Design an enzyme around this catalytic site. Sequence first.
Site, PDB file in Angstrom:
ATOM      1  CG  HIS A  29      -2.030  -0.948   1.148  1.00 37.86           C
ATOM      2  ND1 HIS A  29      -2.963  -0.891   0.138  1.00 37.86           N
ATOM      3  CD2 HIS A  29      -2.407  -1.968   1.959  1.00 37.86           C
ATOM      4  CE1 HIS A  29      -3.870  -1.835   0.330  1.00 37.86           C
ATOM      5  NE2 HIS A  29      -3.576  -2.485   1.444  1.00 37.86           N
ATOM      6  CB  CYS A  67      -2.886   3.361  -3.519  1.00 41.41           C
ATOM      7  SG  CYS A  67      -4.044   2.094  -4.007  1.00 41.41           S
TER       8      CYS A  67
END
EC number: 3.4.22.59
Lengths: 240, 4
Positions: A91, A133
């Site tokens: 992430h 992301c």
Amino acid sequence: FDPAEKYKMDHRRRGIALIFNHERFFWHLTLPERRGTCADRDNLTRRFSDLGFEVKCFNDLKAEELLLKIHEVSTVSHADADCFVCVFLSHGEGNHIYAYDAKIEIQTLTGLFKGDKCHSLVGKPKIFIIQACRGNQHDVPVIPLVYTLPAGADFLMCYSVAEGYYSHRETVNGSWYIQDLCEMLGKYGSSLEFTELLTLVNRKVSQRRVDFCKDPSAIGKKQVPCFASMLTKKLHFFPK
Amino acid sequence: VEID
């Protein structure tokens, strides 16, 4: 001045490719598991091994452990290597990725390989690939109507998505970007120039869309990858 | 498909 000048890729070794693979996170970060990431890890391992890299993987390292390992690698000699590759699967948001327990700013990691900090990679490609992301925007679909060297030179930063956006991962096949990167490595890695190949990956990823989703508002959403080159020459991975 |  040769417009066709290529990096010298005739060292005894291609070099090391590190893969930091993050599937789960400290509970308090409230980050969901990243199913499909070990498929990316395995896919990359195969493609980069085929290009001659010595691949080393680390799974769910804590920030301190991750930093220690990257520092170690930045300090060992790369004299007899063509280049260095470092992959993060995790992430992220803003300019950071997550280790198991904490965020790390990407510049902390890359700074350790700048020319003054890592002399044996001076003049050699230093390639970072980041599947994560980068913010909370979900891209929408549209249709058409003495010569010394700078210590900052010869990095190539390869991001799965442009700044500020979500990036997508299939729970079984792996991330859109790593699947398409690996497909292109398989077909073209040993022949095409590497930024030419990354451009193909941009086109592949940009063709995908969220076909189904529990959130109907996210159906049809999109992603374009983005690479930043501070390279000074053409980069190929011809068979060694 | 999931968000990273």
